[PDB]
Amino acid sequence: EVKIMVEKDPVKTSFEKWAKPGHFSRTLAKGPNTTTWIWNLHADAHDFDSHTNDLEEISRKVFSAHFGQLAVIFIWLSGMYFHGARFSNYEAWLSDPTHIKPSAQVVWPIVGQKILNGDVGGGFQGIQITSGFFQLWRASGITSELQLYTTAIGGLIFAALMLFAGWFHYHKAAPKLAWFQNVESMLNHHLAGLLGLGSLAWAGHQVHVSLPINRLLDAGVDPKEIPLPHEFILNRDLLAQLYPSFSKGLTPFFTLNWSEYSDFLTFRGGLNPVTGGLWLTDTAHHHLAIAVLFLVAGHMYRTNFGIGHSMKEILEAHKGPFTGEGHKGLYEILTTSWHAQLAINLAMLGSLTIIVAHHMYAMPPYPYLATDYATQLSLFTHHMWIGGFLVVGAAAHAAIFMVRDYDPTTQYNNLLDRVLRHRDAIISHLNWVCIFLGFHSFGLYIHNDTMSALGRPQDMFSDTAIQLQPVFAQWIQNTHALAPSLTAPNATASTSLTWGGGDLVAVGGKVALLPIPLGTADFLVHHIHAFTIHVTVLILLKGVLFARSSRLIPDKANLGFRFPCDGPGRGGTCQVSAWDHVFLGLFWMYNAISVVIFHFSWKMQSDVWGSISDQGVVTHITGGNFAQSSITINGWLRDFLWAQASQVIQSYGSSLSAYGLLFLGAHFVWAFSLMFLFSGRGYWQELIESIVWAHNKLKVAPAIQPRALSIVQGRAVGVAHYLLGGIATTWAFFLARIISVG
Amino acid sequence: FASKQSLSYLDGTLPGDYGFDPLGLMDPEGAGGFIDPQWLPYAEIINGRFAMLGAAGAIAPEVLGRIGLIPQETAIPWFQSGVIPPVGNYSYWADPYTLFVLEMALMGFAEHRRAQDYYKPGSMGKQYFLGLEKFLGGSGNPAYPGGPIFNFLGFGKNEKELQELKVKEVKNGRLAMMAVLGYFTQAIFTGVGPFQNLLDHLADPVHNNVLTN
Amino acid sequence: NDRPLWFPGSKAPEWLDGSLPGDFGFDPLGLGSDPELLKWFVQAELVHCRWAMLGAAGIFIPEALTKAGILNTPSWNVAGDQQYFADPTTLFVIELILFAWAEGRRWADIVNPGCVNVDPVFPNNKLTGTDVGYPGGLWFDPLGWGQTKDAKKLKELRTKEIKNGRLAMLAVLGAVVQANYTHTGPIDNLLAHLADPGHNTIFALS
Amino acid sequence: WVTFYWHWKHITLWQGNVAQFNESSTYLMGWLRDYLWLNSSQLINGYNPFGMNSLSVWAWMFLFGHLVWATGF
Amino acid sequence: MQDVKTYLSTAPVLATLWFGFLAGLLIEINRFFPDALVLPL
């Protein structure tokens, strides 16, 4: 049944298809009559399922493209490591991580840009990075530039390797469709092999090299006197000097008496009191448990060895009264369509990125991470944006599947059919709840603004006037604050310091974390978050459901997934496809994520961070003005935008000048997007004729006739420039603020 | 003759055709790349040859130095001699790295000719090899070159005894592969050569077997 | 049709046939696929191996004669930082001026074969070469060698030449690399190696 | 653009330091920092958690404008 | 080899080669002749 399947040498490697630019699609392989050929070439350059029709070639192309992407990622990683090795103040940072700003990039002195190499400390001059790579290397046990150089080379090797594979499995030994379809063995190997063995190997590295080196770094010894990471491998006695449990050998693990490993396999909440990060003796135990979890979970599905589940008997068995014929006919969907898999994978990966961004700020896993505010803010914002993009991509690919892979002749299996058969109800109720949330979230802010404007603050929705204390979040905080005493007797402390329990921790001045309060100003913004998320789901789900047909256009699936409009008739049918719904949902995703990152920035600078002095007095950065000034839009205008934007604007003539330049650059790009977002193709196509006339008058008429951008490319360009401008503006503002004041 | 069913390719032809393949790595349906049924027997053959050549040399110094024949240069562990510097190394007439590049230069000639005889059977008997152009033609299977040099004595004349010799060779090669794997592993949980492990097991197995560390 | 290759058992590529000297079928990347580029690359390699012969003879022999206690010329590395009657820029300008003429006439010979053979001052000298790259003539071939039987005395000599020139190229590149790895002369490398070929090699540094 | 130019020129004339416009307008961040960001300190402070003053109405209208403007999009 | 030259004759490759050569030229000029505001001719 399950076996290796390969077709020897299916495509001769050559340069013939390389000289003919358009070769994948026959419609544009002929040549560029007009200039709307250069555009759609790059447009459908990666539309593998559009060039051909057989799943086999599509799957082979997908495989090789994955290999190329992995090679590019490996080149990126090797470059980051080589820069940390050659142009970084890492060794100087290790001797004083609380007074040396990280930096791993230097600039050539050519045109006066030399001043971008600011004084970061340690006798170095370069741009201050915020990737958090220094903390990651300190937590990994890396303690010398040499140990970076090597791994850089290592990465490069893998890069080449990946490229080789990418060529091989398309040109010498490419599989056939029947091989990719074995999803049972694929999941078996990704659970047991990739995640399980990977976690086990990292737990091994931790428990062997990362624990003793980091412990000796916490004891205050010089990073040069620390023995090399192999002196703890060929000397169990030198390692047992810190964790004497190693003196007991590998015997406790095999006699099930491994409760004596409590030295390096701990269960302790809170953060390390000197590094402001998690206990590596805890993360080692965590990885050791996760590894065996994924390993025993990688034996569920059936292969050619008789035992195991089959993910078709599992599906059909779930078929209730309310839901027609259950999950029947879904195993046929997710093994004969690459899009219905990409949708689920993108949705789950985006949600997981959001979970990661929420967890890492609250439980700092790297030493001296919660101290460096710039890194902790960038790692939140970047990951939030990535997740917000991935979820919209999931929506788009679900729409694509519904448009050109769905068919009813087999989808009489009343689960997808049933949800398709009450879309007019799903979207109606989602619309109503969106309206309700929008009103009961934004009208409260408008109320507060009008009251504070009418000289009557006593009628506001503040924490002094009518209160809206979120009781459920407070109860959850109080419940997790008491867990290490009742509902977690073995855990020494709560999982995080953000819960109301616990106390403050300092890393030499600046504060790392403390219990976070929750008042009305948090109630309002959480409801605003819910409202924006709901509107985004509304747009995307409406597009996905009405991707096939609607009352307006009953044969929309014949038109396709991507098309501008079905005429100016029926009153007007502009922006009626699913691609246009993704276009419209990108802006609301941008809105939502921008509000989230503003929330996080202000709340952290106001109620979390700061610099404590002796006797315990702690003064936050802004001064705790979030609970009172964030209830009115004017407060977000002056106390957040106007006030905090005072660092970037006056950064000229300093090491933070590039942020001040990119502020205005991103403003220009954002405003430039409006030219494409507001205008239309006809005006520009007409205007181009009056320029072609002047060209013909002087015999400079090009042979590739200059047509204007299509109605869909205009929208694509507009949304791309809009997102670039907005995100780059927020990037520059956030960095120029937090680098100087954090 | 058991532990698997002779599905469609382990009929009984090859020397050592015990019909054992629970995964199906010789299945001729998907065969491209390196797991075709013509590369796997060859790979097993010469991996077993190298294991037979290594599982003897791993113990030879340690067992010879106990007879007092060799001077006290024979590293009682097979690994304290150059092959791994950090756990001990012996000083020879040259750097281990120049020894390594000399070994690679001498082995490139020894291996590229064999590769060309596998990929191109009749070749390596046409191009004038320097000095005495020797008759090293591909006399039959790329795993049994025959010849007046690779068969000094001509041991094995007709099909019966030659097939017996072949199956003996593949069985000894599998045994030697398992032996060198055991060397590699038990050099970690003990910290001493394999012959010393055997001696300490002969001392008393109740307190010196694997279940003591 | 019988000829030895750079890789026994392989097949010579289609664009290589052993007609031109020094041919061993070595062209993995296919850099000489079309003849329009082959007729250029052969001249490139010829001029290259000749210049490399000259450079190797200029680098290695004076170094030995300096170490042999005979000559006293400085090392080949720092022959630029010496005392000559004119600045290096002036000598370089004079070199370029003198070389423009020769290399232009050679270029015209390569592009249009035979278009440039007669002395433009005394129009009777008439260089005697016939194949591009081997200009012949009393100036470039005084001893008459070079005009012999069609093959086995000409082709043999030309391949025996390119065989030496490739070795010279490798040797001079190696001298260049060694003069930066080990900051000594190229003959000191050989001396230190022969003194202890076991421990004295490229691995004796890192 | 015309009204921005006129208003900044005359603000700097009436205050007393014409040499702020005469020197901070030749680049573009000067317009964003010395005209827009600087002259907005009493506008947005028309009302705050500490009270309100005569400019409050404008501090409303100002924000109002933005809303309507954004709704156009 | 002919198709390699044809591919190198494409629009993006010639564009990036030209713009990179021009960037190198301008960068060298500015590294050797910096802060040029008035033509001294």
Ligand code: CLA
């Ligand atoms: C796992 C990730 C993933 C994968 C594999 C795909 C794969 C695919 N997508 Mg898709 N997509 C994704 C994520 C992904 N997408 C996400 C996250 C979104 C949400 C934004 C979308 C939104 C989307 C739409 C709306 C469409 C696709 C389409 C496609 C198909 C053709 C793509 C193509 O030819 O593009 C070619 C690539 C380009 C033309 C590059 C454009 C340049 C980008 C827009 C700018 C990049 C900016 C950069 C970061 C910095 C700018 C500055 C610098 C340039 C100077 C292909 C199957 C199309 C289709 O028809 O599917 C069949 C289609 O219409 N996707």
Ligand code: CLA
């Ligand atoms: C600031 C600009 C702005 C505003 C206010 C809105 C408002 C709205 N958009 Mg929206 N939109 C905008 C820009 C804006 N959009 C842009 C630029 C785009 C392009 C990407 C879109 C794209 C877009 C899509 C694709 C969708 C929406 C939807 C919605 C509605 C969500 C329902 C809701 O929350 O109702 C709450 C409404 C408000 C908070 C408006 C203010 C109401 C005030 C507070 C009450 C005033 C009291 C009283 C009535 C005044 C009487 C006056 C009288 C006395 C004279 C809502 C009407 C969704 C929709 O239709 O869902 C229903 C939807 O699907 N929009």
Ligand SMILES: CC(/C=C/C=C(C)/C=C/[C@@]12O[C@]1(C)C[C@@H](O)CC2(C)C)=C\C=C\C=C(C)\C=C\C=C(C)\C=C\[C@@]12O[C@]1(C)C[C@@H](O)CC2(C)C
């Ligand atoms: C010309 C040359 C040397 C010239 C030396 C000169 C002028 C001497 C200069 C000096 O005297 C002066 C001036 C001053 C002295 O005081 C010092 C020096 C400086 C020493 C070397 C060429 C050196 C050139 C070398 C070594 C080239 C090696 C190229 C190889 C092996 C290419 C192989 C391939 O191209 C093929 C064949 C086919 C493809 O399909 C595959 C690949 C691999 C791409």
Ligand code: SF4
């Ligand atoms: S978009 Fe194209 S189609 Fe839709 S209305 Fe405007 S013009 Fe008519």
